Amino acid sequence: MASPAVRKAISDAALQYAKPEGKIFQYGTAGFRMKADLLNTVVYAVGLLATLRSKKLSGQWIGVMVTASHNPAEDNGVKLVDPMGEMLEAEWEAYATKLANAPLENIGDVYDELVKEIDVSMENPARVVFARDTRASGSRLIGVLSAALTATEAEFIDMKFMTTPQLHYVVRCKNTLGTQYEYGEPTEQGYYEKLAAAFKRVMRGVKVKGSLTVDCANGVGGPKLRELIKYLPEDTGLDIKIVNDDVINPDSLNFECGADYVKTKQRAPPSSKASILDRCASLDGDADRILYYFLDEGNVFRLLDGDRIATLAASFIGDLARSAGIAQKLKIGVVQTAYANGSSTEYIEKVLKLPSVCTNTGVKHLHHAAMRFDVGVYFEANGHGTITFSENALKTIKNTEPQSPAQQRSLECLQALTDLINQAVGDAISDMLLVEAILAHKGWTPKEWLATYTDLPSRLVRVEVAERSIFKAYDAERKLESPPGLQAKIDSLQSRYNKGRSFARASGTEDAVRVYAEAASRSEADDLATRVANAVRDAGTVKEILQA
Numbered sequence: 364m365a366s367p368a369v370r371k372a373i374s375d376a377a378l379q380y381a382k383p384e385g386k387i388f389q390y391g392t393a394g395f396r397m398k399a400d401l402l403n404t405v406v407y408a409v410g411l412l413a414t415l416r417s418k419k420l421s422g423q424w425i426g427v428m429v430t431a432s433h434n435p436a437e438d439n440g441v442k443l444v445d446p447m448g449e450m451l452e453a454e455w456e457a458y459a460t461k462l463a464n465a466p467l468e469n470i471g472d473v474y475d476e477l478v479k480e481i482d483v484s485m486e487n488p489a490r491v492v493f494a495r496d497t498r499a500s501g502s503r504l505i506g507v508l509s510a511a512l513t514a515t516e517a518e519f520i521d522m523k524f525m526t527t528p529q530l531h532y533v534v535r536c537k538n539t540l541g542t543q544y545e546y547g548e549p550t551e552q553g554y555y556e557k558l559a560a561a562f563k564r565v566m567r568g569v570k571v572k573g574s575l576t577v578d579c580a581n582g583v584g585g586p587k588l589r590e591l592i593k594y595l596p597e598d599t600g601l602d603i604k605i606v607n608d609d610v611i612n613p614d615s616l617n618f619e620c621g622a623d624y625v626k627t628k629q630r631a632p633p634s635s636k637a638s639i640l641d642r643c644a645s646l647d648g649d650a651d652r653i654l655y656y657f658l659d660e661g662n663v664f665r666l667l668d669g670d671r672i673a674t675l676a677a678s679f680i681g682d683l684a685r686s687a688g689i690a691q692k693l694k695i696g697v698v699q700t701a702y703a704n705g706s707s708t709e710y711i712e713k714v715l716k717l718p719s720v721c722t723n724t725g726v727k728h729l730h731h732a733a734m735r736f737d738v739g740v741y742f743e744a745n746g747h748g749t750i751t752f753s754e755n756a757l758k759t760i761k762n763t764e765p766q767s768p769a770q771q772r773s774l775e776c777l778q779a780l781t782d783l784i785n786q787a788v789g790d791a792i793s794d795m796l797l798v799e800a801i802l803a804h805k806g807w808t809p810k811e812w813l814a815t816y817t818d819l820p821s822r823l824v825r826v827e828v829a830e831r832s833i834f835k836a837y838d839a840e841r842k843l844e845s846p847p848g849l850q851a852k853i854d855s856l857q858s859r860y861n862k863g864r865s866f867a868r869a870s871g872t873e874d875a876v877r878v879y880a881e882a883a884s885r886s887e888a889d890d891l892a893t894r895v896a897n898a899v900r901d902a903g904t905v906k907e908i909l910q911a
């Protein structure tokens with residue numbers, strides 16, 4: 364219910380900036396994200412929101428990450444991170460949005476509106492940690508953020524340049540020190556030591572073969588990976604070659620590299636100098652996504668995307684849980700979207716003998732569902748993912764008495780994985796260490812990993828429609844309620860093709876629907892995708908009103 368000097372300082376500091384034309388803002392997944400010259404007042408609003416989130420939650424540290432991830436050099440973005448390093452509570456997105464869309468002259472009053480609607484205790488100082496990627500606009504935007512935090516009399520720490528996962532790491536640590544489940548030392552240094560020490564344990568008595576060439580998107584992941592390498596152990600046989608670390612030139616960020624580029628264009632970066640069979644990976648620009656790839660013997664680009672990594676991780680955890688003797692005690696499952704290749708799902712259920720849960724798209728539904736297992740593996744094709752360990756999981760690992768040196772070795776190994784794998788957020792660097800460790804333990808070349816199952820040919824298409832809003836989905840977005848008859852037709856179309864599977868869903872932003880289709884052969888997959896694409900387009904063109 365306070366205060367006068369704060370209201371004044373808020374509206375005064377706001378008067379430094381101006382709202383772009385008639386821009387309407389929305390805090391989506393990953394927050395606000397757009398052209399960097401539209402972003403001053405938006406980041407201001409988030410500085411203000413952050414103050415309120417911290418105070419509502421007893422002065423716990425709340426994080427802000429300034430990044431636009433995959434996006435080109437001239438975008439930026441801003442998102443809040445909650446106390447345990449988790450993504451901002453779904454219902455607080457709407458507050459961010461209310462603040463962003465306010466006229467500036469009124470922003471001090473909308474702040475008051477919120478301290479009353481949210482019911483915040485003003486005893487506590489707000490505490491916020493922030494960091495940014497390598498973008499040119501970062502410095503200016505950090506100044507905007509800092510003017511907001513100052514007007515609110517928050518305590519803040521500028522953690523400088525970090526990957527997104529490092530900023531989730533810090534937040535969680537700061538809020539867990541003194542606790543029973545201390546996540547680590549809340550510094551970049553502590554992040555490195557924790558990864559190093561865990562990698563070391565997982566790697567006991569085994570060796571990585573051949574080098575790893577890591578495309579770092581010319582992003583913050585590049586210098587952080589290099590810094591991490593200084594902390595890693597010596598006789599693991601890890602040999603990381605860093606490429607695309609041109610962080611000094613903002614124009615280079617995500618320019619024809621790394622992860623998003625490789626995944627969506629399904630080819631290596633054009634600048635790549637890797638040879639035949641060289642094991643490779645691409646990080647995205649804020650290093651929360653990764654994928655693997657290689658040129659095979661005949662010189663063909665071979666992608667190993669998020670789903671590939673998911674089945675790799677699930678195979679490894681499954682084998683370890685069994686030999687640790689806890690596989691019957693613990694619920695272990697893979698969480699996927701409907702975008703997952705059918706062959707990947709088949710491998711999990713038939714060969715790994717583990718549940719798969721199809722859930723709605725968006726890390727939120729994926730994480731929430733992975734937390735229903737004791738050991739929940741989720742990746743998206745795009746390279747975002749992690750493994751979640753429940754308290755039960757940690758406890759039964761920590762407490763079970765082993766009946767053999769193999770059983771003990773597996774339990775130790777499993778314990779280490781728990782500290783290696785980022786629990787707050789999908790972490791490209793952590794995931795990298797994971798994949799390398801697993802390949803070492805299995806003795807697998809990239810080609811043996813690819814050979815594990817064969818993807819059904821698939822095709823994704825973007826279908827423009829009149830109104831995105833008439834396409835209403837359910838059952839992990841695999842079925843349409845609306846418009847009438849479309850599902851019946853999708854059902855019939857997929858039946859005509861060997862192992863034929865297709866589904867269409869709205870994008871949620873555009874006036875477009877996405878069609879996914881897969882089948883036994885290329886021509887089938889393409890034809891099915893086109894047929895569903897035409898039906899979608901047909902049901903999505905304005906009906907047309909008759910006369911007399």
Ligand SMILES: [Mg+2]
Nearest residue numbers: 432647649651
């Ligand atoms: Mg990212």
